[PDB]
Amino acid sequence: MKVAVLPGDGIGPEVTEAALKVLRALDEAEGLGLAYEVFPFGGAAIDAFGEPFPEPTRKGVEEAEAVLLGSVGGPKWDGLPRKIRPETGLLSLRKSQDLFANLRPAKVFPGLERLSPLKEEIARGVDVLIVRELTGGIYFGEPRGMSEAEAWNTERYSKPEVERVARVAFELARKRRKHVVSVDKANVLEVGEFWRKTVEEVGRGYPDVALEHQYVDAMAMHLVRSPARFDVVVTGNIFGDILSDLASVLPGSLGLLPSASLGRGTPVFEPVHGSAPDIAGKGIANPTAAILSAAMMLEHAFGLVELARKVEDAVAKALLETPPPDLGGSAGTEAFTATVGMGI
Amino acid sequence: MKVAVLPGDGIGPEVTEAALKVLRALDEAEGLGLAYEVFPFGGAAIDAFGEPFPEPTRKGVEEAEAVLLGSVGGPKWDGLPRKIRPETGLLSLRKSQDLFANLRPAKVFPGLERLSPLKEEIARGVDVLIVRELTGGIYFGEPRGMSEAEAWNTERYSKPEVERVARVAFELARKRRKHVVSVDKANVLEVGEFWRKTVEEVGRGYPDVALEHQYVDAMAMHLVRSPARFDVVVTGNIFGDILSDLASVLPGSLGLLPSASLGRGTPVFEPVHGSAPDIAGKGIANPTAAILSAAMMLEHAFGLVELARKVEDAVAKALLETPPPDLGGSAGTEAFTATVGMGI
């Protein structure tokens, strides 16, 4: 279980250490063979290598079987050239590993329904996995320009593109509740009809998985009126972006969501939250995201689905007994990691 | 107050008649000089003129001071050539009058907070107006094709396009709570940057209006976690679609929301809902959308803001006292219109 840790900056190291604490325990008491070393990354790496994604980190991720990344960003670099802003290192990291699927989970933990903006009855049972296309769509396509009179961007998709992400969606379903929802806008866009066609063609290989299609705007509605009826949601770039951000508000608060970036290289698991450099080092940051990101890696990078389900539960338990400040409590980082530890 | 009524098909005529019943009463009791004639439109017009938007209808809307349209669509024509499908008639109608702004309101009426999927506290006070670009964006741009290996669509916007919709947005704000939120995806797309630029440029003229910008996905979040802090929301085509459908579920169900199409021609007011051919004629359809549509026309096409606010209230009233089947009740179309009438 070799893992490359890229703590980053802000509460990055903070939340990453906690996940490591939980990980070392889980490993020690289970014999996992977890082996790891911390690598400079983002603004941190910048302060010692000039670049946010240095050469030894690139090698560190390569030779690693998974990546447990924290957070990057900060004012100390918000005024540096793009090519080397910490943000860009995330893109270089992604690209170096060919990460084409960004798994964005959104689950309301039992007992935490009142933390959500949805009535306790709708928030109850919510456990969706939004798989979004990472390297295609209107985000990168050409042409694309601006002028005094007009601007333009291009949403293009290729059969190999859509096939491998949909492929990732069906495999993940097989391990969840076996149901996927390909989202698109096929009723008014060629790409949508093209996205549908391909996914349907790829679903045939996964008969044990139920494929249901839906329009992007219609799906926005059912994500707020019936989130629980959804398991795995596969979709394109810009829409993945919108649907992922939408699902992210369903479970109480954003500092509770993990993240993963699957592709052809070393997977990368990380908290969706920012670096919050202001609260950095004040021990007040909630390590739930980082810890749950650690779960994600166990299940998705090593298949330890049970162990991951364990950690998840422990967190859910801790969020209840010793809730963090953001959850209307007072359990600082250190404290909260202890309680999580318990359920381990 | 000359009005052109295009009942259309499905529950089109059903829900339209109701609004007209409310209308005739409001007029009779207050002397409004409401004058109107119904015109063949959509699938209906197709079975008498071969085309969805016949010549006398075109003339009917032209000479008309406002259009109160119902619904269009049905199986009877789902298989006819595009240039003649009922759906296209809407596009011809919209173009014929240079309508480029779809006003999609979403307000949770006081006392109806429990009808929303959002906690009573967040659904309280919600009254947003989502202004969406109707004739541009990725919806129409070229190129746009399909092939075995790939598909493509083009999102392009022109200074003149973004200026007039944003114009509409600011004038509408002046009459509401004086706040606008231009939505886009400037942080990753040329068009977004372009959209922002222009709207900023147009806002200068409306200093008394507060202009706040937001990204599409981020906005998706605040529309579920903080709807109340929003008044007027202006945005592009596809995004207007997504954000308008989203805000449509905040107040309860979709058959409750009206619609408007502002531009340089005869404005058209219509219920967002579909034609529901199946339930057509079985007096089970909820005329709330159609009647609300009729209120929108009163304020937005005649300025009778008080009268419009009156109808609105009566509908809120009747949706409580004599709720429709969709609202967990059993007050058929004819029944419901009577109660609405009362509050008039």
Side-chain angles (χ1 to χ4, degrees):
Chain A
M1 181 184 157
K2 180 143 72 313
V3 158
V5 185
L6 285 39
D9 8 278
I11 70 177
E14 208 140 16
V15 324
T16 314
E17 210 224 309
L20 278 197
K21 274 189 164 129
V22 165
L23 269 179
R24 230 123 21 118
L26 205 72
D27 142 275
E28 197 202 5
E30 256 270 48
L32 295 197
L34 193 186
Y36 78 87
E37 86 124 279
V38 169
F39 285 100
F41 193 72
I46 276 153
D47 281 1
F49 304 78
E51 19 173 40
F53 184 42
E55 123 73 9
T57 291
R58 238 148 120 142
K59 280 250 176 173
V61 153
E62 262 248 323
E63 275 100 57
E65 315 182 303
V67 166
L68 173 68
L69 190 161
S71 175
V72 306
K76 153 123 162 241
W77 315 273
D78 279 338
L80 232 48
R82 171 128 292 154
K83 173 170 132 121
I84 65 143
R85 244 185 175 232
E87 1 297 15
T88 298
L90 237 29
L91 263 154
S92 325
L93 190 216
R94 228 67 82 227
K95 198 125 163 259
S96 118
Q97 293 322 314
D98 201 0
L99 310 187
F100 50 89
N102 167 241
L103 276 50
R104 279 290 294 266
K107 324 172 161 171
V108 169
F109 288 144
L112 288 170
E113 282 86 356
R114 69 123 240 292
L115 208 60
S116 134
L118 330 159
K119 323 214 113 129
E120 256 109 285
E121 246 221 293
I122 304 141
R124 173 160 74 247
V126 168
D127 176 17
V128 47
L129 178 64
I130 296 185
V131 159
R132 108 197 249 289
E133 224 292 309
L134 238 252
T135 78
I138 218 228
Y139 266 39
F140 301 117
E142 318 249 11
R144 39 188 312 201
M146 123 86 158
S147 111
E148 182 69 359
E150 98 161 35
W152 60 102
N153 280 281
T154 312
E155 179 120 48
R156 53 186 53 247
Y157 255 109
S158 83
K159 217 231 262 165
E161 229 107 38
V162 188
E163 279 191 5
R164 33 110 91 126
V165 46
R167 236 141 54 208
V168 155
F170 285 116
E171 316 259 89
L172 239 36
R174 232 160 235 213
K175 327 251 208 297
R176 272 190 149 235
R177 278 154 29 229
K178 287 95 134 122
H179 170 59
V180 332
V181 212
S182 135
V183 162
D184 58 37
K185 236 292 159 179
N187 70 332
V188 198
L189 282 211
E190 283 78 9
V191 233
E193 315 211 49
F194 181 75
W195 178 274
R196 199 100 124 177
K197 163 72 255 284
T198 325
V199 175
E200 183 41 282
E201 130 134 270
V202 71
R204 277 187 5 93
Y206 307 78
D208 54 305
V209 163
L211 183 31
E212 81 151 271
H213 294 322
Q214 294 230 273
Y215 302 124
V216 59
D217 54 328
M219 169 64 92
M221 277 179 319
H222 331 306
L223 241 273
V224 184
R225 92 176 321 221
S226 321
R229 86 153 237 231
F230 301 117
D231 181 24
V232 170
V233 202
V234 77
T235 205
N237 243 273
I238 179 96
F239 287 163
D241 234 53
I242 310 200
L243 299 177
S244 271
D245 232 74
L246 179 55
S248 264
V249 298
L250 262 42
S253 292
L254 337 148
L256 261 34
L257 338 140
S259 260
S261 261
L262 265 301
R264 141 228 114 63
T266 272
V268 168
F269 306 89
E270 65 168 292
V272 169
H273 62 70
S275 4
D278 281 347
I279 67 168
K282 323 297 101 200
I284 88 189
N286 177 179
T288 299
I291 287 149
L292 288 185
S293 311
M296 208 139 170
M297 163 187 33
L298 288 161
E299 156 182 30
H300 286 103
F302 306 97
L304 285 31
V305 188
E306 37 250 293
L307 261 171
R309 218 83 164 49
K310 230 120 287 273
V311 158
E312 192 177 326
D313 307 357
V315 160
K317 200 120 154 223
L319 283 164
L320 285 158
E321 8 186 354
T322 23
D326 49 307
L327 294 206
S330 44
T333 335
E334 214 76 63
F336 181 95
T337 315
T339 306
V340 159
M342 286 217 317
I344 285 311
Chain B
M1 224 213 249
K2 191 141 276 242
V3 186
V5 182
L6 280 32
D9 2 313
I11 74 274
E14 195 133 32
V15 302
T16 303
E17 191 21 55
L20 269 182
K21 237 155 311 141
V22 168
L23 235 27
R24 301 182 291 257
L26 207 236
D27 154 62
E28 219 125 5
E30 328 274 354
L32 273 56
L34 162 69
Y36 80 80
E37 104 139 75
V38 9
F39 292 98
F41 188 82
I46 287 184
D47 284 322
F49 310 94
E51 68 221 15
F53 189 20
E55 281 323 327
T57 307
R58 244 197 256 51
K59 226 135 134 0
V61 335
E62 183 223 302
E63 340 256 319
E65 234 148 56
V67 156
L68 157 67
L69 154 70
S71 22
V72 309
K76 219 248 198 229
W77 328 274
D78 253 76
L80 312 206
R82 189 169 346 281
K83 307 92 245 320
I84 88 171
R85 67 165 88 287
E87 299 76 273
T88 300
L90 224 231
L91 320 166
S92 300
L93 204 207
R94 249 79 132 307
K95 231 309 143 240
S96 134
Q97 310 287 295
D98 189 33
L99 295 173
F100 44 81
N102 203 32
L103 250 56
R104 215 112 119 60
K107 111 177 266 224
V108 150
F109 292 105
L112 273 284
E113 285 79 337
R114 120 190 212 91
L115 189 86
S116 157
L118 289 294
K119 295 252 210 310
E120 237 171 284
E121 240 136 17
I122 99 142
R124 227 186 53 103
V126 176
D127 180 3
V128 43
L129 186 34
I130 292 175
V131 188
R132 124 136 156 319
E133 215 283 271
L134 255 157
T135 97
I138 188 130
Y139 264 12
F140 299 125
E142 283 91 332
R144 55 102 76 70
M146 278 197 58
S147 328
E148 165 272 273
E150 36 130 357
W152 52 108
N153 266 254
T154 290
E155 182 186 28
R156 136 179 51 256
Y157 255 91
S158 104
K159 232 271 202 35
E161 265 169 335
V162 183
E163 226 151 353
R164 42 178 201 182
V165 282
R167 237 190 292 286
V168 184
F170 286 95
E171 216 320 284
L172 240 357
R174 282 239 176 97
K175 303 178 301 218
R176 297 160 111 298
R177 289 101 95 215
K178 256 133 178 72
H179 163 70
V180 144
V181 180
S182 177
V183 171
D184 52 78
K185 199 32 162 129
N187 63 13
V188 46
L189 283 177
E190 284 73 319
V191 178
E193 306 189 47
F194 186 105
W195 184 283
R196 218 187 269 318
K197 231 120 69 182
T198 311
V199 174
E200 275 177 22
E201 181 239 47
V202 180
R204 294 178 237 282
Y206 307 93
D208 61 316
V209 162
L211 182 68
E212 162 185 329
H213 292 260
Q214 230 114 264
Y215 291 118
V216 63
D217 64 326
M219 176 69 193
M221 279 190 306
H222 331 319
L223 214 63
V224 155
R225 62 108 140 284
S226 203
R229 74 168 276 236
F230 292 137
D231 161 350
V232 163
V233 178
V234 29
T235 185
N237 215 348
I238 190 150
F239 289 174
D241 234 57
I242 292 164
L243 310 206
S244 48
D245 237 31
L246 217 211
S248 90
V249 303
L250 262 28
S253 262
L254 230 177
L256 242 131
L257 279 343
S259 172
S261 277
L262 267 288
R264 257 152 235 130
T266 292
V268 342
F269 296 85
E270 115 211 34
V272 175
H273 70 76
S275 23
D278 304 323
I279 77 163
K282 325 204 156 296
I284 154 189
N286 186 195
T288 309
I291 321 196
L292 274 197
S293 299
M296 289 232 258
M297 154 181 101
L298 243 29
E299 105 136 323
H300 289 105
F302 299 117
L304 271 342
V305 287
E306 228 115 315
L307 264 47
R309 225 75 122 326
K310 161 147 252 200
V311 183
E312 252 147 68
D313 167 17
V315 178
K317 234 87 252 69
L319 262 173
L320 258 160
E321 321 206 345
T322 17
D326 34 285
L327 260 234
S330 248
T333 181
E334 211 120 277
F336 189 82
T337 317
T339 312
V340 164
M342 251 131 50
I344 293 302

